[PDB]
Amino acid sequence: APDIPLANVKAHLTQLSTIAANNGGNRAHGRPGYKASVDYVKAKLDAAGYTTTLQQFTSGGATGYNLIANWPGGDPNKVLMAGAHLDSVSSGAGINDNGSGSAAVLETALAVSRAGYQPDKHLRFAWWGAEELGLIGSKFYVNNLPSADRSKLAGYLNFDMIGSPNPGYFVYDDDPVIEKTFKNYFAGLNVPTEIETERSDHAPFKNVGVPVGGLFTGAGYTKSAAQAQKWGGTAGQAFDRCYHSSCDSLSNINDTALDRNSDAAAHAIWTLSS
Numbered sequence: 001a002p003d004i005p006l007a008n009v010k011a012h013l014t015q016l017s018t019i020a021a022n023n024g025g026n027r028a029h030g031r032p033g034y035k036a037s038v039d040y041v042k043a044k045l046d047a048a049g050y051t052t053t054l055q056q057f058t059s060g061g062a063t064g065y066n067l068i069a070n071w072p073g074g075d076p077n078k079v080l081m082a083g084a085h086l087d088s089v090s091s092g093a094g095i096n097d098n099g100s101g102s103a104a105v106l107e108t109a110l111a112v113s114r115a116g117y118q119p120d121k122h123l124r125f126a127w128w129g130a131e132e133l134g135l136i137g138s139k140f141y142v143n144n145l146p147s148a149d150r151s152k153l154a155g156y157l158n159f160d161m162i163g164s165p166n167p168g169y170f171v172y173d174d175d176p177v178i179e180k181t182f183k184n185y186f187a188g189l190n191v192p193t194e195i196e197t198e199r200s201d202h203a204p205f206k207n208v209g210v211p212v213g214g215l216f217t218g219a220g221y222t223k224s225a226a227q228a229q230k231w232g233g234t235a236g237q238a239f240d241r242c243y244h245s246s247c248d249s250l251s252n253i254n255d256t257a258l259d260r261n262s263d264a265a266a267h268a269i270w271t272l273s274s
């Protein structure tokens with residue numbers, strides 16, 4: 001896999017930050033900052049050669065969207081998916097929750113195009129709407145994916161909060177092959193990981209038998225002494241002190257965590273799509 005350029009991931013975050021500022025301070029479902037976020041990501045994907053789909057739904061009396069991006073080619077009967085919710089809560093820009101995963105998944109999709117990668121498995125990326133309403137977008141997608149297509153999914157990889165300011169390095173303990181591939185990347189960095197225990201958009205996939213996995217750097221729970229010894233930062237402070245807050249801004253990112261998890265996303269997408 002290529003090394004995902006941190007500066008490019010950070011530049012998507014800057015664009016999302018400015019979209020929030022331009023639209024009432026947030027990127028929430030049913031508010032203009034969300035659709036403007038979708039339009040930004042979609043434009044980058046279209047330019048890179050993806051086939052994009054806007055999947056519309058209604059929730060809470062407002063139109064929501066999922067953005068689906070299919071990379072043409074690969075085995076139609078073995079599809080690898082990777083995704084991230086693109087909405088924020090209405091209190092702020094949602095830069096770590098979940099600009100971080102949205103930006104990492106977008107830059108990985110652009111990196112596939114830049115590398116001329118032709119995976120054996122067909123690649124499909126997704127940006128989910130209305131996760132903060134209760135996984136409404138990803139539930140809508142799974143609920144509307146025919147059983148024949150669900151059976152074609154080799155895996156779904158989720159990235160939701162991967163730049164936390166006081167980070168841990170958590171790997172989902174779900175499908176064993178997906179988990180091992182993420183843990184191998186971190187092993188190569190000599191960065192220890194822990195099993196994620198602290199829901200998100202992998203749940204509707206997991207619950208219908210699709211293999212899942214993912215990366216997470218912590219939210220409102222407190223980093224322990226033992227976790228600060230292995231990863232640095234501050235024991236006794238939340239992993240993300242601006243979780244769901246107005247201060248979940250461009251300042252709410254640990255660049256090293258964002259970089260490593262973006263590089264790990266690409267590592268796993270390449271490995272599992274071979």
Ligand SMILES: N[C@H](Cc1ccccc1)C(=O)O
Pocket residue numbers: 097098131132160161196198199200216219
């Ligand atoms: N529930 C997610 C955060 C989360 C993601 C993954 C695991 C645990 C928590 C959110 O607030 O958007």
Ligand SMILES: N[C@H](Cc1ccccc1)C(=O)O
Pocket residue numbers: 250251252253254255256
């Ligand atoms: N992005 C922060 C540093 C930073 C924090 C707040 C504002 C600007 C920069 C880090 O990686 O440590």
Ligand SMILES: [Ca+2]
Pocket residue numbers: 003004005006259260262263
């Ligand atoms: Ca990198």
Ligand SMILES: [Zn+2]
Pocket residue numbers: 085097098131160161
């Ligand atoms: Zn989230």
Ligand SMILES: [Zn+2]
Pocket residue numbers: 089097132244
């Ligand atoms: Zn959230």
